[PDB]
């Protein structure tokens, strides 16, 4: 699996959806309408196109200065 | 462990701190400073009385347990030390050292760090230990009494993307009333890393102890700061000598909390964050930026950006 964050419509989209692709939710932020996800590797196409979804971008890192 | 005579680090001292706190230490009951970083040695002797809350956000799970909140790093440590280590006998004093902190730990044992850590921790930083942004609903967040928001969100760490929810919570902090600063990056580079690139946050690059630019500061930063041989509280319960953009960050952190908090000590408010651009004393940035040490060519340079801030000329403008 690899951890994502999908922006969405809040009032447009329903969490449950994502464990029918194999997804399970991390984390649903409560200021921007915005979901940490973990899905497999081959199913990143398939989140992008769920009712709700504007966007889906995948977790980068940072580093330490 | 056999604690030393406190010391006062070059820094502090090149920031013109010390003049500030007869003023104010930043000791104002509304001002918090958030600092997301490696988590903090949390009873350390030179910085436990600060340490507000102390929190986690590793790997999207947010924890307020003290042991998931402790640094294992350092890096966190060294960081809230130069903002906020209390002025007293021992070790070393911060920019503003009677500052409340919140430690909110995004970066793990190795300083590692996931930007979804971070974007959870700024979103921490604005809703407080409390859960809640805005709990009496008036739109005023960082400044609001009844609110526990931070006023400053410290993030001496960056990374090479630019992502659109990131992005989208860095937004929430700044329209929240708070100020954000981040290390520009320790490359060498032409420009800051993110979140310190974003026009709402303020980017910072280091200086050394002769006045010149490291080389390893990132460029085009908007303000400099001292972030060579920097000796700064460390694990566990002792001080340590660092460099790095994440050094810088601080005191410009610790800046403009004297500068919230001498303005809400005379006003019962506190000033706009303002943006890059700004050259007026009727913000947070713009008064930062007309009071910095201008060093380098004139004005605004890549590499010292409008200049190395300068609190007690800072504060003496938000309250003039
Ligand atoms: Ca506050
Ligand atoms: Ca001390
Ligand atoms: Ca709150
Ligand atoms: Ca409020
Ligand atoms: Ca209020
Ligand atoms: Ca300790
Ligand atoms: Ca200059
Ligand atoms: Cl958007
Ligand atoms: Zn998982």
């Known amino acids: ?65 | 462990s056999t604690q030393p005579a406190q010391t006062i680090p070059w820094g502090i001292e090149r920031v013109k701190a010390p003049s500030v706190w007869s003023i104010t230490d930043g000791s104002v009951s509304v001002i918090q400073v958030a600092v997301l970083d490696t988590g903090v040695d949390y009873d350390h002797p030179d910085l436990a009385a600060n340490i507000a809350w102390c929190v986690s956000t590793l790997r999207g799970k947010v924890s307020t347990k003290l042991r998931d909140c402790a640094d294992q790093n350092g890096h966190g440590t060294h960081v809230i030390g130069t903002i906020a280590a209390l002025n007293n006998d021992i070790g070393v004093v911060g920019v503003a050292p009677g500052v409340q902190i919140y430690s909110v730990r995004v970066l793990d044992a190795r300083g590692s760090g996931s930007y979804s850590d971070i974007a959870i921790g700024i979103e921490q930083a604005i809703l407080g230990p409390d859960g809640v942004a805005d709990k009496d609903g008036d739109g005023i967040i960082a400044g609001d009494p009844d609110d526990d928001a931070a006023e400053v969100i410290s993030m001496s760490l960056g990374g090479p993307a630019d992502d659109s929810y990131l992005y989208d919570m860095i937004i929430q902090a700044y329209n929240a009333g708070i100020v954000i600063v981040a290390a520009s990056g320790n490359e060498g580079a032409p420009s800051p890393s993110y979140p310190a690139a974003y026009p709402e946050v303020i980017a910072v690059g280091a200086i050394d102890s002769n006045d010149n630019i490291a080389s390893f500061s990132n460029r085009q930063p908007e303000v400099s700061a001292p972030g060579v041989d920097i000796l700064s509280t460390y694990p566990d319960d002792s001080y340590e000598t660092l460099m790095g953009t994440a050094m810088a960050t601080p005191h410009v952190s610790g800046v403009v909390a004297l500068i919230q908090a001498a303005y809400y000590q005379k006003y019962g408010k506190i000033l706009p964050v303002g943006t890059f651009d700004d050259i007026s004393k009727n913000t947070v940035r713009g008064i930062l930026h007309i009071t910095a040490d201008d060093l380098g060519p004139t004005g605004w340079d890549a590499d010292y950006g409008y200049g190395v801030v300068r609190a007690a000329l800072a504060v003496q403008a938000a309250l003039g």
């Open chain 1, 1 to 65: 699996t690899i951890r994502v964050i999908v922006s969405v419509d809040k009032a447009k989209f329903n969490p449950h959806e994502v464990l029918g692709i194999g997804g399970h939710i991390v984390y649903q932020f409560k200021l921007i309408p915005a979901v940490v996800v973990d899905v497999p590797a081959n199913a990143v196409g398939k989140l992008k196109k769920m009712p709700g979804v504007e966007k889906v971008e995948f977790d980068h890192q940072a580093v330490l200065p």
